[PDB]
Amino acid sequence: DFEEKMILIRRTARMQAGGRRFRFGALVVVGDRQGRVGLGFGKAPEVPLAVQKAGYYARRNMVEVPLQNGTIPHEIEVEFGASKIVLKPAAPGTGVIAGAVPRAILELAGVTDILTKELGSRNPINIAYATMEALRQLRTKADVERLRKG
């Protein structure tokens, strides 16, 4: 039912008593292109197991996005660790102006027009988390009105 996307497989190693033990980490985006996005990071000693785990985690940790005309209600600027993401609403017929990682995240959201920029460190995991936070921190006119007026 949910679409799946792949960001990175990385093979990390740790030393043992005369040799190396490997473990694979997988980053996965899961979305329905209607305003639901999940990001999963999964570790396993074997690649398909890692993919499955990441998919599972993504299906758990889901985020709703307030889409209107396939864009973001308001520009945002979120720093996670040493990574920084800048999102800006765009007019229709603009497309997703983003790097590989932000594009991967935002495509499965249903966003069709946006401008983005990465700042500071560009470690993909941190960028992915920062994008997640920026998506999680969005508000509509209605939400803000309810908060203020009630």
Binding site: P92, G93, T94, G95, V96, I97, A100, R103
Partner: protein, 208 residues
């Protein structure tokens, strides 16, 4: 200079029928009905998943190959569409469909865009009662496209417009099948065109 050489190989590479050759690509011979895999020695091997760049490039190449125009002219048209008002995609498609050769093909004078280009270049086509011999000419809503009096009896045009009897033309066009003439009414919509192209990828490609 346009592209001269094998054609249905483009059909194969792009993975969509892309009616370029006219009649053959309607018969069981379009080369999509036999060997629909890309050409070459490694045409039928399990390929790695395409990159973002690859996806955008393929989309752009497909859209360009449909109309058979140079990359330079394509980029110029895209720039013009970008600078204009409204949606880039819709305006871009409207600009690609306003070409004289494309309009000629649409109206049914020719079976293919290449034949239409040849007819235009060879002076068999008139616009508002004046000879125009340039495939890249841009027509505007409220223009009269007709076949030159001299060429009204040529076998090609005669049989092409004989086959257009009791056949529908695009909603953004009208045709007087007996009158050897047509009419351009308005810019075609995104919905009007049956293009197998998602122009969003073209926009994204040119953003880089």
């Amino acid at each position: 200079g346009r592209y001269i050489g094998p054609v249905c190989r483009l059909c194969r590479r792009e993975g969509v029928k892309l009616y370029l050759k006219g009649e053959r690509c309607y018969s069981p011979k379009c080369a999509m009905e036999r060997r629909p895999y890309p050409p070459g020695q490694h045409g039928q091997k399990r390929a790695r998943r395409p990159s973002d760049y690859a996806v955008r490039l393929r989309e752009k190449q497909k859209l360009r190959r449909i109309y058979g125009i140079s990359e330079r002219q394509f980029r110029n048209l895209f720039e013009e569409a970008s600078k204009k008002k409204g949606v880039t995609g819709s305006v871009f498609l409207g600009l690609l469909e306003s070409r004289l050769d494309n309009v000629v093909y649409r109206l049914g004078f020719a079976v293919s865009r290449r034949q239409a280009r040849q007819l235009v270049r060879h002076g068999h086509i008139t616009v508002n009662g004046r000879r125009v011999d340039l495939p890249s000419y841009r027509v505007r809503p409220g223009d009269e496209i007709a076949v030159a009096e001299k060429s009204r009896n040529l076998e090609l045009i005669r049989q092409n417009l004989e086959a257009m009897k009791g056949r529908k033309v695009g909603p953004w066009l009208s045709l007087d099948v007996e009158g050897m003439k047509g009419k351009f009414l308005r810019l075609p919509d995104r919905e009007d065109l049956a293009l197998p192209v998602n122009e969003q990828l073209v926009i994204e490609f040119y953003s880089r």
